[PDB]
Design a protein around this ligand. Sequence first.
Ligand SMILES: Nc1ncnc2c1ncn2[C@@H]1O[C@H](COP(=O)(O)OP(=O)(O)OP(O)(O)=S)[C@@H](O)[C@H]1O
Ligand SMILES: Nc1ncnc2c1ncn2[C@@H]1O[C@H](COP(=O)(O)OP(=O)(O)OP(O)(O)=S)[C@@H](O)[C@H]1O
Ligand SMILES: O=C(NOCCO)c1ccc2cncn2c1Nc1ccc(I)cc1F
Ligand SMILES: [Mg+2]
Ligand SMILES: [Mg+2]
Lengths: 272, 279
Amino acid sequence: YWEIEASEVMLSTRIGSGSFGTVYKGKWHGDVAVKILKVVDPTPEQFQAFRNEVAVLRKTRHVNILLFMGYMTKDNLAIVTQWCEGSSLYKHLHVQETKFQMFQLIDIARQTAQGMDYLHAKNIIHRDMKSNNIFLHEGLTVKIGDFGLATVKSRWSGSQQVEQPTGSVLWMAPEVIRMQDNNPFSFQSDVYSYGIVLYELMTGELPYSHINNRDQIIFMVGRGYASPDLSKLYKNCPKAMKRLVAECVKKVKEERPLFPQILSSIELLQHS
Amino acid sequence: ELKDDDFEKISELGAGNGGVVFKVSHKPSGLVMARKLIHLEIKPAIRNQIIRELQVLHECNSPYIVGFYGAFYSDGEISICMEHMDGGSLDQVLKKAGRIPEQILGKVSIAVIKGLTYLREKHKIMHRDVKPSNILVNSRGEIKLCDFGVSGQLIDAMANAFVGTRSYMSPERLQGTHYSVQSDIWSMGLSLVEMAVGRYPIPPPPMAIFELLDYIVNEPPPKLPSGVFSLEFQDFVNKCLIKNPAERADLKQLMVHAFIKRSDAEEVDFAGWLCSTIG
Ligand SMILES: Nc1ncnc2c1ncn2[C@@H]1O[C@H](COP(=O)(O)OP(=O)(O)OP(O)(O)=S)[C@@H](O)[C@H]1O
Ligand SMILES: Nc1ncnc2c1ncn2[C@@H]1O[C@H](COP(=O)(O)OP(=O)(O)OP(O)(O)=S)[C@@H](O)[C@H]1O
Ligand SMILES: O=C(NOCCO)c1ccc2cncn2c1Nc1ccc(I)cc1F
Ligand SMILES: [Mg+2]
Ligand SMILES: [Mg+2]
């Protein structure tokens, strides 16, 4: 258990890089995904916190979340996870412009809510929640990846986590953009990111398409001057789905529903 | 044209939030050029549009604009092949030397003003990214501008980006109001302050990105430390760092500014100082 021997894993063609690592395709006990973490010299405190997170993520087992096989300290610092052959949700919506029916979109929303509810029931805050970290395995089954890993996503000022934000800003909740608190990541920030994912599903486009600067987006979202306008939602989207996406992207943190409530709402939606 | 298989990476010049730049060798021609890899997942039509818009860079010829060889999309990444600048960027020079001397900065600011007015006059292009890391120098003493907004689609695609650490954006752009080359002048002024002093000046002698944006929108602009800089340089940066774009000096006023004329008259061994400080 614990760390994986790098001799066992084999790195195939590189796939891409993200906010905190570069993903390689592996072949350890079958097809796996290996992400080489950008951290060059993990602090012993940082490494121990990463090993604790690794154990916690290993314990998790849900249909809508990808398996976290483990880590390896030989090929630099890397994390081995389940490989998903299906395309990401971001590629489906934006890059590939997959034409989903309304019920398929509602199913993707419901399965993402299922996975996120499982993660939050385990006290796992899937920071960096976005359309990139959702894969449509086997055609339509949702697979949430790249959850947790706060000790590795965030750079460390030695024995101190930098405690500054990271990841994509289009999905970032305003309270964690502002960083007014040392711990702005919570279930509600994940709910806001999920609401941005809902906006992408129910619009087919990324929010703030009228803003073409990242710093302008950061400032206007943090100041409350910018919010995803809901006139972009599809006309065939059910009104209660619109209400749910409005409620999830609410500027006030405590106003956002938790994921059991989102699941109840979507279950009401599907039965019409 | 240019293809991925034609390049052999020699070393990593550097990486930014958007992407990474590699010092590569073009095998058919055998010349060392810089290859910037910008990874982004966009539609094929957006890729073609970005390449077409970057093709304008073929006539972007100026002693203050870095050269351009070609651009192509290989695999999930936009690759722009520009001339290799031995000196790197002024961010590297700042990491080398504690603070850039005032005369070299005068030379740098003259180069930045000339490049900005060249882009504006002959291409109607705003740089939008005047940073110390986007001004590149040569072992022969040239100073050139890179990473300017030639492609609007590339700017839109790079809007979906990961959060940054610092910023050199003028308050009018952050607030979203109308912006012009005055924004680039504000960025130049901030860069010149950051290079004259030994640190980023947004938090006047850490802070997250939003706190920095809030400061540079709602707080007085930074100023050079009095007593260790000439009055002409301080006046130049103060005229560049004016929150109101209308009161802020434009390129024409900056060119005839006392500091610019003083620095132009002065003879400074920029190449020798650069070689001494970077080895
Ligand atoms: N388990 C996986 N299976 C298949 N492809 C994956 C997997 N994890 C990541 N990828 C791909 O690897 C590339 C980069 O992914 P990441 O490194 O996780 O970056 P990201 O997911 O876009 O954003 P973050 O915030 O860094 S997690 C993308 O093309 C993903 O589709
Ligand atoms: N033509 C070039 N010749 C030599 N070095 C270069 C060249 N272009 C870029 N570099 C280096 O590559 C580094 C990475 O630059 P970019 O990829 O444009 O991102 P950046 O300059 O760091 O700005 P951001 O805000 O981080 S995206 C620069 O800091 C330079 O040191
Ligand atoms: O590279 C960019 N930004 O990187 C640093 C942060 O802006 C950049 C940003 C926007 C853009 C629009 N059209 C081209 N664009 C860039 N590329 C680029 C353009 C001209 C040259 I000459 C060299 C280059 F690398
Ligand atoms: Mg991912
Ligand atoms: Mg740059």
